[PDB]
Amino acid sequence: VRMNVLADALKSINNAEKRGKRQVLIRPCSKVIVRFLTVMMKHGYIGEFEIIDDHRAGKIVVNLTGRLNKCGVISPRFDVQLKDLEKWQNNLLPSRQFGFIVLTTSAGIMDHEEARRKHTGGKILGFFF
């Protein structure tokens, strides 16, 4: 089994970062995982990543720095309504000055600072800081 793909991915990157590894191996790839890691890269918590291709489900290899501290999954996937947002944002972030809870909306996957500017809630996926 592996009922949550996203949940198994992030624990690897958490464990790896602690030891100090700067290359990892994450499987299986999913499109959901790609856009996740895209957001995590833009802000600058991780570096460029390579998708190896198979004909099964792919595998991914990542280049990372010590900048990452902790990325989590939130299971099950709750709804957020842009007043429920603030209650969430307190609990998952160590500060008001940094960290980004991530979520998916009908306007696509993005961080919370961006979602508030689209004025649309949606389903929450994970978090990080």
Partner: protein, 142 residues
């Protein structure tokens, strides 16, 4: 954790908690109500009775004293309680076969101090408080 965290598991949570709340000690007295039924009070703060006879109770070890209680039967439930007399020499201000007003000790069903079997004290002997008898703000009406 160690428990389900589905998004459709509201039933299995809300029925489980409603069951495991019954093992709690406080809850099990409150909600069975057998506490009230067993109590010589109806659950009222005080109660009124009529004196039967003075008694003395010898305190639990290591302390040794005689604690000068009374024994009283109640009006509103017709059953008997052994009740402490506070201050010094207020045994004398109680006279047998009169009414008194009783009240719990202050530990809610459990004997207080070194005296065993006594969960009650006494406040009024004839509409005149033990305080005012002792201090001298009032006097026993004979």
């Amino acid at each position: 954790m160690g428990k389900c965290r589905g998004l459709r598991t509201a039933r299995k949570l809300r029925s489980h908690r409603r069951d495991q709340k019954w093992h709690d000690k406080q809850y099990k007295k409150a909600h069975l109500g057998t506490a009230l039924k067993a109590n010589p009070f109806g659950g009222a703060s005080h109660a009124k009775g009529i004196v039967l006879e003075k008694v003395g109770v010898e305190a639990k070890q290591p302390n040794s004293a005689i604690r000068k209680c009374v024994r009283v039967q109640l009006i509103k439930n017709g059953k008997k309680i052994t009740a402490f007399v506070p201050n010094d020499g207020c045994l004398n201000f109680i006279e047998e076969n009169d009414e008194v007003l009783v009240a719990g000790f202050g530990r809610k069903g459990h004997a207080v101090g070194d005296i065993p079997g006594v969960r009650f004290k006494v406040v009024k002997v004839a509409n005149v408080s033990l305080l005012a008898l002792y201090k001298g703000k009032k006097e026993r009406p004979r």
